[PDB]
DNA sequence: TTCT
């Protein structure tokens, strides 16, 4: 119920405009006797801790800051939950995050993970290996489409009554990215 | 204007 600023959302989740930051919206649902129950109190968003060598802050990618906060969610380890991420950059490999998320999932088997990425972080030369590894660890790895952008707008942004207005090129970029990811996950 |  801490809501994201409209301009922060549109300037970070635009799937044609890269930024030097990462934002991550998350939601948790519990699977019970077949159907799924939304746990609206476990909803939130965060961004990465920025690098700042000067001030001796080393910097922490958004995905690991989500892992940081899981204990506070107080999940029942006998139950099974689906955690959904809407992340403005896909997770990296070379800084260790994909592997850390895999280790978290192996240990925390009560969490299943669904990732929708706005953009592919191919700045990481080994970004393909992060995506395949997350898939191999049991996560759903997907590209955000209109439905997820609107859902994040409706759910996480302080819109004040304004309906989601898709930017130019939202569908074209989502489709192109969905094509690249599918090819990556075919292998 | 790619977790600067
Ligand atoms: Ca959805
Ligand atoms: Cl990452
Ligand atoms: Zn990372």
Numbering used by the authors: 10 to 196
What does the paper say about this structure?
Apolipoprotein B messenger RNA-editing enzyme, catalytic polypeptide-like (APOBEC3) proteins are single-stranded DNA (ssDNA) deoxycytidine deaminases that are among some of the fastest evolving proteins in the human genome. APOBEC3s catalyse a cytidine (C) to uridine (U) zinc-dependent deamination reaction. APOBEC3A (A3A) is a single-domain enzyme with the highest catalytic activity among the human APOBEC3 proteins. All APOBEC3 domains contain a HAEx28Cx2-4C zinc binding motif.
The crystal structure of A3A (E72A/C171A) in complex with ssDNA was determined by molecular replacement at 2.2 Å resolution. E72A inactivates the enzyme permitting the formation of stable complexes and C171A increases solubility. A 15-mer DNA oligonucleotide that binds A3A with ∼60 nM affinity with a target deoxycytidine (5′-TTTTTTTCTTTTTTT-3′) was co-crystallized with A3A. The target deoxycytidine (dC0) and flanking deoxythymidines (dT−1 and dT1), as well as one additional deoxyribose at 5′-end and one phosphate at 3′-end, were well ordered in the electron density (5′-sugar-dT−1-dC0-dT1-phosphate-3′). The central cytidine (dC0) and the preceding thymidine (dT−1) are accommodated in a deep groove formed by Loops 1,3,5 and 7 of A3A. The bound DNA adopts an irregular conformation to encircle the side chain of H29. Compared to apo A3A, there are conformational changes in the rotamers of the side chains of R28 and H29 in Loop 1, and Y132 in Loop 7, accompanied by more subtle reorganization of N57–A72 in loop 3. The deoxycytidine (dC0), which is the target of deamination reaction, is well coordinated and buried within the active site of A3A. As expected for a catalytic A3 domain, electron density that fits a zinc ion was observed coordinating H70, C101, C106 as well as additional density that fits a Cl− ion, with both assignments confirmed by anomalous difference calculations. The structure explains this strong conservation, as N57 of A3A is central in recognizing ssDNA with three key distinct interactions: The side chain of N57 determines the 5′–3′ directionality of ssDNA binding by forming a hydrogen bond to O3′ atom of dC0, which helps stabilize the geometry of the DNA backbone and the sugar in a C2′-endo conformation and induces a backbone deformation due to steric hindrance with O5′ of the target dC0.
